Amino acid sequence: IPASEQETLVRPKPLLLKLLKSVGAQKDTYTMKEVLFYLGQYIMTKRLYDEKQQHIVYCSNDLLGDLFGVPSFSVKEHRKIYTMIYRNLVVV
Ligand SMILES: Cc1cc(Cl)ccc1[C@H]1c2c(C(C)C)n[nH]c2C(=O)N1c1cccc(Cl)c1F
C-alpha cells in the first residue's frame, strides 16, 4: 500500500456514514486516513479485535459485517480491507 492512499478523499455511502458517526464527528467528505482511524476505533472500542485472536476481527453480529459482507477478516490482509471499504464510499 502506498502512503498516498491515505490522502484519498472520500464520500461514505449511508451505511458507512452510520458507523463513522458512532465514533467521530459527522463530515460528508473524509480522507482515507480519517476513515481508517474511525473504523479502527469502532473495532477496538467494541472489542471486535484483540491480541491472541490470531489477527482476526470478528464482525458477524455487527454493522461492520454488513458493510464488509464477511463474518470475520484478518487485519493482515490490507489490500482486501481497502477493497471492502471502497464498496461503501465514492472517491472525490
Ligand atoms: C485502522 C484499521 C481499520 C480496519 Cl477496518 C482494520 C484494521 C485496522 C488497523 C489495525 C488494528 C486495530 C486498529 C483493529 N490492528 N491491526 C491493524 C492494522 O494493520 N490496521 C490497518 C492500518 C492501516 C491500513 C489498514 Cl488496511 C489496516 F488494516
Q: Hey, where are the domains in the chain?
A: 1-92
Distance from the alpha carbon of residue 44 to the mean position of ligand 1, in angstroms: 10
Residue 73, SS3 per DSSP:
strand
CATH code matching the domain that covers 1-92, chosen among 3.30.300.180, 3.40.50.2300, 1.10.245.10, 1.10.3720.10? 1.10.245.10
Whose CA is closest to 72, among 57, 50, 55? Answer: 57
Q: Is 81 in the pocket of ligand 1 (CB under 6 A)?
A: yes
* Cα dihedral: 58, 60, 61, 63 (round 10): 90
Method used to obtain the model: X-ray
Those residues with Cβ within 8 angstroms of residue 26's Cβ, 6 or more apart along the chain or in another chain: 17, 20
Rounded to an integer, what distance in angstroms lies between the CA atom of residue 74 and that of residue 30? Answer: 24
The residue whose C-alpha atom lies closest to atom 18 belonging to ligand 1 is 75
- Resolution given for this structure, in angstroms: 2.0
CA proximity to 27, closest of 5, 44, 11, 15: 11
